Amino acid sequence: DVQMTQSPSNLAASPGESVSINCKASKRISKYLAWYQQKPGKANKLLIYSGSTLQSGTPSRFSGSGSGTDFTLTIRNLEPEDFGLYYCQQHKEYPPTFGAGTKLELKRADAAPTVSIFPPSTEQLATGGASVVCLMNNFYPRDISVKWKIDGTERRDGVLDSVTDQDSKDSTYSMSSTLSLTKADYESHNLYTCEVVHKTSSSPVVKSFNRNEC
Amino acid sequence: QVQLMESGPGLVQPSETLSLTCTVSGFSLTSYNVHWVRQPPGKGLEWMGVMWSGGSTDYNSTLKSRLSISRDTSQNQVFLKMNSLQSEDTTTYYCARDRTMGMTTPFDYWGQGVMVTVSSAQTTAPSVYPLAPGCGDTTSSTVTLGCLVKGYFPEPVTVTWNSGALSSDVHTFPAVLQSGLYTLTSSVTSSTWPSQTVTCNVAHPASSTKVDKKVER
Ligand SMILES: *[C@@H]1O[C@H](CO)[C@@H](O[C@@H]2O[C@H](CO)[C@@H](O[C@@H]3O[C@H](CO[C@H]4O[C@H](CO)[C@@H](O)[C@H](O)[C@@H]4O)[C@@H](O)[C@H](O)[C@@H]3O)[C@H](O)[C@H]2NC(C)=O)[C@H](O)[C@H]1NC(C)=O
Numbered sequence: 274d275v276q277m278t279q280s281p282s283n284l285a286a287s288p289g290e291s292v293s294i295n296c297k298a299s300k301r302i303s304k305y306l307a308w309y310q311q312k313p314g315k316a317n318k319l320l321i322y323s324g325s326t327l328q329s330g331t332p333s334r335f336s337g338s339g340s341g342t343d344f345t346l347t348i349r350n351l352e353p354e355d356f357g358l359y360y361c362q363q364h365k366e367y368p369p370t371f372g373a374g375t376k377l378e379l380k381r382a383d384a385a386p387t388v389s390i391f392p393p394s395t396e397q398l399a400t401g402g403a404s405v406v407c408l409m410n411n412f413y414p415r416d417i418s419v420k421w422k423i424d425g426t427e428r429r430d431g432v433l434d435s436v437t438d439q440d441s442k443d444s445t446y447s448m449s450s451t452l453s454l455t456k457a458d459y460e461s462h463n464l465y466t467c468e469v470v471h472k473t474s475s476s477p478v479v480k481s482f483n484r485n486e487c
Numbered sequence: 488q489v490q491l492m493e494s495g496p497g498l499v500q501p502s503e504t505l506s507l508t509c510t511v512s513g514f515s516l517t518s519y520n521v522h523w524v525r526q527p528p529g530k531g532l533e534w535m536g537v538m539w540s541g542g543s544t545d546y547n548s549t550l551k552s553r554l555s556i557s558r559d560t561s562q563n564q565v566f567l568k569m570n571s572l573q574s575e576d577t578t579t580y581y582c583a584r585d586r587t588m589g590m591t592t593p594f595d596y597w598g599q600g601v602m603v604t605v606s607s608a609q610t611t612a613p614s615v616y617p618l619a620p621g622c623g624d625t626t627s628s629t630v631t632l633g634c635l636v637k638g639y640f641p642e643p644v645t646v647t648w649n650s651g652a653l654s655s656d657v658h659t660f661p662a663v664l665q666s667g668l669y670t671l672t673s674s675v676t677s678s679t680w681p682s683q684t685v686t687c688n689v690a691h692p693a694s695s696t697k698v699d700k701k702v703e704r
């Protein structure tokens with residue numbers, strides 16, 4: 274098989290800037306390398322083929338070079354719509370083989386998270402369980418860390434979290450963190466705090482509630 | 488336009504036959520090859536095999552013994568049947584088209600892929616709980632509300648707000664798995680709550696459930 278090595282795994286750039294992405298075949302394959310774009314909610318889309326030929330409809334800011342082993346996709350003058358994942362496929366021989374992909378992040382201005390904390394619902398406590406939720410919405414950059422504290426002591430047990438992909442309208446991220454515990458555990462403590470560190474604040478953003486006020 | 492569409496079960500059990508269908512339109516199966524490709528969890532694309540235009544098949548040599556590809560030209564369908572699945576895997580499977588005339592095209596059109604969950608677990612509908620500020624938290628002019636969609640299996644769900652009418656700062660987060668069940672949150676903002684009602688609509692196709700939860704109080 275022709276092994277395709279793609280680099281890098283990741284890029285970040287601003288709209289209007291230029292990036293390039295490399296693929297390198299393990300054997301010479303003449304000009305027969307194609308580039309594709311992947312974007313949530315869309316089938317993988319053929320951009321370039323035979324190294325440098327644009328598919329009909331591909332904007333002129335995309336270009337490709339190379340013949341032999343070494344290929345490069347260049348994207349100039351980036352549009353928002355161009356942020357997503359790219360991969361290469363050789364089309365010299367079967368089996369089809371593919372690069373491992375490059376995720377291109379849209380670099381926008383810093384944005385501080387809007388932090389919200391939510392006590393368990395009485396509906397859920399009826400079941401004997403409790404979930405405390407902390408949302409950290411519409412922030413940039415991705416880098417973030419969240420601590421839960423219960424009566425001033427860090428709790429990492431029973432915490433799960435996840436982060437959205439970059440927003441289609443404002444290019445931010447959002448994170449949700451859930452502290453799960455028994456009703457008995459929940460009711461054995463008073464102060465619930467989620468503590469959120471992000472480069473937009475010189476010290477942590479803190480949201481807390483006292484269960485005794487619920 | 489050219490289209491390829493994968494379909495199959497969202498959940499199989501270990502050792503059940505996994506039957507996938509690729510339904511095509513806007514070209515003839517006797518004129519183009521249709522390939523099957525998978526993307527395991529974590530990973531890049533892996534070629535599984537091809538339904539050649541002329542009716543033969545070829546396979547990834549390491550997977551050959553576990554795959555069967557076929558088609559029904561009258562129905563514009565290509566099939567992939569496989570067996571010996573991997574407990575707890577959530578692979579995505581794709582079909583894609585190519586041809587060879589003077590040269591071999593790359594794959595010019597793809598389907599959007601389907602994800603299959605492999606498990607012996609039961610289908611389980613979510614409980615839906617409100618996310619509302621409480622417990623002495625002063626409510627700003629714009630409030631963040633949400634719904635906690637807890638304890639469902641398998642993926643996916645969908646969440647909408649006020650039946651689609653509300654789409655201000657909607658975020659539906661990736662689900663997390665623990666003790667074999669998924670939990671996700673979905674949030675929206677409102678400047679008019681609680682005078683104006685905010686309701687999440689949660690669908691879980693696998694369990695045939697659709698539940699509304701009005702967020703108040
Ligand atoms: C035909 O089907 C084959 C499956 O039967 C496909 O095989 C897969 O091929 C990919 C690409 O070569 C492999 O992915 C690589 O895995 C290695 C090994 O990773 C593990 O070990 C290292 C070191 O201990 C560790 O760093 C990793 O995290 C893993 O624990 C990685 O080093 C590579 O980066 C890459 O991910 C698959 O592992 C392999 N699967 C199996 C089940 O063998 C093959 O791609 C198909 N052929 C075609 C043409 O698509």
Ligand SMILES: [Cl-]
Binds near residue numbers: 301340341342
């Ligand atoms: Cl060459």
